[PDB]
Symmetry: C3
């Protein structure tokens, strides 16, 4: 005997069957997902951070003018200044009633703070997704691992179980992301040797200790000002600093489908998409599913704040009355609005907060809490102004 | 009793079972998908449109030459012109070198037409996908909603149904799109402050009413021409206009898997990918599937026009003979060619048009109509020439 | 009667049921996947290759001032100077009062080698995914095709089979790729008219025979050097050549989920993600699944070489003892490490090599071979240094 089924891939909402095998005491099978880990394969492309300008001591020369070649230094520059000979100071500096020459030069290197303050630009692709399912068969509790890259057969309670491959493997991570501290961003970060001044990627290197530093800060050598010889130049404030102010909110709180982002190993958790098929040694006869959901009534939607076209810029709040504290499912029956989370716990208190998203100022959607529906009407404000860069 | 099954996620091709429950009159269950809505979470990055050059009145000055600083204006420019055009007040008074300094300046602001003619660049990620399934149980017809972010249990006809989560959620939308009018494009549009002259994103601002206008039109101040003082300058014709001519065909007609694009709320409809699992209170004994497909013969392929390496640039036409008007499935058994639609209605007329795609000039694939096969042979022309920009 | 099931979408690991239909001889059904083809819809954006500089005949002036306009050639460059004073005159030709003049110019065109040595930048999106399943029903063997864009009903062995739509359609290809020879890369290649000097896309054209050549090699006209008139200029070595050295490893060996890349028609093979649901005319009573996996013990992990944050930069080697040569499944129970392949053949020899990936130097994960586990401890080196471009 082999009975096949399929449970939802959502952490929380359980599967409860009432296995009444003709023999004696009836078993109450119940398996539900408790975790979901989707780790991508980060392929570090490069890292960027505050840069540090570097100009060595200048070469005071006479009319015996020199000419600077070209070395291998990040954004390295050099210019021989003719008749910029600062002129005068004490003794005799170039009596030639014509002109001397100034050999000014300067390059770039990543600030001494990169080590403990830099962002990373990885190129990630979903590597594997596995889930932990806790099955409570009668008087036995066991946790099984389920993947996408293959099924998994296990024997629990003297019964054989086979948790077929997860239907799909959805990822909230794009193919190009940027990890800063504990934050993760989905940015189409400029390629390696393609950074632009005053913008993310101002300077670039494979790693902090790397030795392939690339920069493009628009370092421009200016002509010396009479008085005390020094090296004047124009640049463009650390793009990295600029990015810090620009870069919006992280994925950490804009992840769809209730997906939760984490940073150390970098992964998406409890992402709610798909189903997990199972099968056992029992006739579809002994099997009988149980569906006991918290009955709720007097639903009421209330939108506090809401922002126009921005990943979940709205905030809905549902008031209600329940008969039993539980865990319900939330949905939107209007394509004009989308819900971030895909579930919410229903407490007898009567308060549920959800984040929604829409691109229509003044939208009118209908949210749902289990089997109850309610309308939501709100007026949203357009997205914040950007942070204009060096104009 | 719990019997599990799974129907295709294609709008049209139905599921028909013959439930012969031992009691009496036999039931004829039949459930099929009728719609599919996959809405993404657009996160407006910025919008662009035709720009408008703005040059204020010029500052006529004497040899008492002035020097222009630098204000905060889009692509703002200014240049002090030393020694321009012989004309004067009094009797050529200035004197002190130069003869005449000119303070010319000009910046940019989005054209007065952006409001009702601008494109939008959103950053979208699949937010939710739901489908409408019409189940016709015996003498009862009911429509149920099915999602990916969770299952859904419903009671219909005194029988309990549970439409498990949709297998997967495929999206024809990339992570960076551009919405113009009723069209949608998959473009890796340049980032915010990174627009280039004569190219899409010439100017950029979060919103039309925004106040973070960014531009890079390559505005260059030219020296005045003797005669009537005015402000000469070089620019680069509105990249936006250029884009209009460049931007190929929209996704609206290049969407794979028969997916249909829509614009108001922005979503993909009837996308044909996946399956929808269901389960009821009935033994696999009373269940018996029915598969009555239109039998067709004398299949014949004929390729009219075909373009090389371009999203579905070919057009196949199948002639045939059917026994009953119905709805068949179309497929390609040769990796060298791919079919856009995944189904086609079979009329007794004998005419079926399909769009195919291949990257091989002179390909030889085999299309299929239900259970009938036929060969297609055609010779394709390479893709159209691009529209070279300001050379 | 209709019994539903679901087999894994992995080439190799089979499905084996023991159909004991009360009638006579017990049947041994066994169906397994043998291939998987996911072809995308490449939409050729443009191609690039080594460029070739072109310099017309130098306008050897003398007593005039021929001025240059703006030709329509690729990145036209024209400058006119007033030197070349070695002598070269004679008087009988140029008895002028004014000094010499000279108008030099150049433009670009793709090297004569593009035809048989160029890369291509396509814009690809999954078009269709089909799989070949070999079902061995009793004393009959038949191969059926299964897709995502619809189900497929077939009759084999006098029994009716319906292979529902594949759960999902995972693709290892991004939305922007680059095909070179037999290699495929996932690169966010610069758009059409947006190429940069000394970088991939130096020059760009829709096709090799195209007539929309675009270039940006930073061609700079230099002033002639006294002696023999010629045309001096500065450029930037073929970005294409640079790319050749830069462009890392191809997708061909970094494809996740054991996916295998191919080049002629361009597709991903045996990609192991998902499940394939089936159904027949038999009670869940006659059905009984069989799961006979090779029992292995004395597992031992040994990491040879390992590279930090780079798509599968590590290499694990498992030693062991088996009871029967077979085919096992490999997994990682630690989010800190991911396995490339999703299966491995188990020979009595006792040697299995796997590629893993992690972003943590000095990681400690636990690999698995069927039902056996083992720990892996290794220390990895950071990713190679990039290849700094023209500094
Ligand atoms: C297989 O798994 C089954 C289900 O999963 C749970 O397994 C356990 C082992 C954990 O790993 C959980 O994380 C899993 O969810 C097992 O069944 C569960 O067993 C556990 C262990 O006893 C039960 O834990 C208890 O949880 C409740 C939670 O509160 C809510 O309970 C329900 C909702 O489910 C409602 O009534 C209501 O909404 C409640 O709010 C909690 O009350 C308990 O916690 C308190 O007591 C424990 C010890 O008794 C203590 O550790 C905590 O600090 C809590 O506070 C006080 O502690 C002191 C001493 O520490 C006590 O003296 C005092 O009484 C406590 N005061 C309070 C706050 O009342 C407790 O942790 C859980 O309820 C079961 N889940 C189910 C099915 O409902 C199953 O046992 C296992 N297999 C088997 C059968 O072996
Ligand atoms: C359960 O669902 C069944 C099927 O639902 C389908 O609905 C369509 C619209 C799609 O969504 C499909 O994918 C669904 O599967 C229901 O059965 C359907 O019943 C209707 C009516 O019996 C059928 O629809 C008709 O089909 C005929 C062809 O036989 C058309 O001529 C007809 O066109 C018109 O319909 C409008 C209604 O908007 C009428 O006002 C109009 O006059 C015209 O009707 C025809 O009028 C002329 C007089 O001028 C008369 O001579 C014709 O007899 C009359 N036609 C009929 C029969 O209506 C319309 O499209 C549909 O074909 C049936 N589906 C099938 C093929 O099984 C069933 O009723 C549902 N159960 C319940 C009660 O909820
Ligand atoms: C179904 O496939 C099997 C392979 O699994 C075929 O069996 C092979 O039979 C030949 C000759 O009898 C042997 O040399 C192989 O070793 C067999 N393979 C195995 C492991 O069974 C079988 O013939 C096929 N069924 C048909 C078409 O009759
Ligand atoms: Br990149
Ligand atoms: Br961007
Ligand atoms: Br592009
Ligand atoms: Ho600025
Ligand atoms: Ho041009
Ligand atoms: Ho990009
Ligand atoms: Ho260089």
């Amino acid at each position: 005997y082999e009975h096949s089924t399929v449970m939802p891939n959502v952490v929380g909402f359980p599967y409860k069957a009432h296995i009444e095998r003709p023999g004696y005491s009836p078993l109450t099978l119940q398996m539900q997902v408790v975790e979901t880990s989707l780790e991508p394969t980060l392929n570090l492309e490069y890292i960027t951070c505050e840069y540090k300008t570097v100009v060595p001591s200048p070469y005071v020369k006479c009319c015996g003018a020199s000419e600077c070649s070209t070395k291998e230094k990040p954004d390295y520059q050099c210019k021989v200044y003719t008749g910029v000979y600062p002129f005068m100071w004490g003794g005799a500096y170039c009596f030639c009633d014509s002109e001397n020459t100034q050999l000014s030069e300067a390059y770039v290197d990543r600030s001494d703070v990169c080590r403990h303050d830099h962002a990373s630009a990885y190129k990630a692709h979903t590597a594997s997704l596995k889930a932990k399912v806790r099955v409570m068969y009668g008087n036995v509790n066991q946790t099984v691992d389920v993947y996408v890259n293959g099924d998994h057969a296990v024997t629990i309670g003297g019964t054989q179980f086979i948790f077929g491959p997860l239907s799909s493997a959805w990822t909230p991570f794009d193919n190009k992301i940027v990890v800063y501290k504990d934050e993760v961003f989905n940015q189409d970060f400029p390629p390696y040797g393609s950074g632009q001044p005053g913008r993310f990627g101002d300077i670039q290197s494979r790693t902090v200790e790397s030795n392939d530093l690339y920069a493009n800060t628009a370092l421009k050598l200016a002509r010396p000002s009479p008085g005390m010889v020094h090296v004047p130049y124009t640049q463009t404030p650390s793009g990295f600093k600029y990015w810090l102010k620009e870069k919006g909110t992280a994925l950490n709180t804009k992840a769809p489908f209730g997906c939760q982002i984490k940073t150390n190993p970098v992964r998406a958790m409890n992402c709610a998409v798909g189903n997990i098929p199972v099968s056992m040694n029992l006739p579809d006869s002994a099997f009988t599913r149980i569906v006991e959901a918290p009955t709720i009534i007097d639903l009421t939607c209330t939108v506090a704040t809401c922002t126009h076209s921005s990943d979940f810029g709205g905030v809905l709040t549902l008031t209600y009355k329940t008969n039993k504290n539980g865990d319900c499912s939330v949905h939107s029956h209007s394509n004009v609005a989308t819900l971030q989370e895909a579930t919410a716990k229903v407490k007898t208190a009567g308060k549920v907060t959800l984040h929604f998203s829409t691109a229509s100022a003044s939208p009118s959607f209908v949210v749902s809490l289990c089997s109850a529906r309610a309308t939501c009407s709100a007026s949203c404000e357009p997205p914040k102004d950007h942070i204009v860069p060096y104009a």
